[PDB]
Amino acid sequence: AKTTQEKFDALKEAGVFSAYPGTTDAKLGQDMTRAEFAKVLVKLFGLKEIHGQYSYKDKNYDAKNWAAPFIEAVTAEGLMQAKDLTKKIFDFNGKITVEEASKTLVTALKLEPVKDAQNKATDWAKGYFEAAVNAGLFSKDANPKANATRAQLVEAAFAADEMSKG
Ligand SMILES: CO[C@@H]1O[C@@H]2CO[C@](C)(C(=O)O)O[C@H]2[C@H](O)[C@@H]1NC(C)=O
């Protein structure tokens, strides 16, 4: 049974995960931005980067933003969307939460959100989070509302990859 560090090392060699920005450290206890996680999803699921399209109005979300091709890909794929459909705000620099990551992976894996889900998650996410817990993507005592640690994201990505091979 691989450790989180072993899983990270496998995913890093595969080009799916990177070290913590500006370092060579895995920093498994640190958090991850929504921008960085969009890139993880693109690499994990083999999505095509989308250049020259901008679906959001966040300040400094434009052609100079390195993450736009990744964010656009996960948007086109239906994995991520805005937090605010009026102002069209993705919150690219906000940290990805456990329940947000759960939605992306449940969606990519074509798992059914759980009806009548009763758990700690924000209302919109209860079904997604429950499906992710039931599939072993996050541990049962993970806080859906917390920022996901890099460890948790490695564990979840690794399990998603295992579920995508066949
Ligand atoms: C606060 O609104 C929620 O925002 C969530 C942000 O995280 C993800 C995973 C996303 O699509 O990026 O899920 C979003 C939720 O669907 C929800 N957004 C909307 C428009 O209902």
Numbering used by the authors: 28 to 193
The study reports:
S-layer anchoring is best characterized for Gram-positive bacteria, where S-layer proteins non-covalently attach to the PG layer via species- and strain-specific non-classical secondary cell wall polymers (SCWPs). The crystal structures and binding analyses presented here of P. alvei SpaASLH, SpaASLH/G109A, and SpaASLH/G46A/G109A with synthetic SCWP fragments provide novel insights into the functional contributions of many conserved SLH domain residues, including SLH-Trp13, SLH-Gly29, and SLH-Arg43, which precisely interlock from three different SLH domains to generate two active binding sites.
To demonstrate conclusively the significance of the conserved SLH-Gly29 and the backbone flip for SCWP binding, we created a double mutant SpaASLH/G46A/G109A for binding and structural analysis. As expected, this mutant displays no detectable binding to 4,6-Pyr-β-d-ManNAcOMe by ITC. Residues 46–55 in G1 are in a similar conformation as in the unliganded SpaASLH/G109A structure, but with a slight widening of the loop to accommodate the Gly46Ala mutation. Despite the lack of binding detected by ITC, ligand is again observed bound in the G2 pocket, albeit with Gln108 and Ala109 in the unliganded backbone conformation (i.e., not flipped). The monosaccharide is bound with the same interactions as observed for wt SpaASLH, except that there is no hydrogen bond between the pyruvyl carboxyl oxygen and Gly109 nitrogen, but instead there is a minor movement of ligand away from the Gln108 carbonyl that results in a less ideal bidentate interaction with Arg61. The observation of bound ligand in the crystal structure despite no binding being detected by ITC, similar to the observation of 2:1 binding in the wt SpaASLH crystal structure despite 1:1 binding measured by ITC, indicates again that affinity is markedly increased in the crystal context.
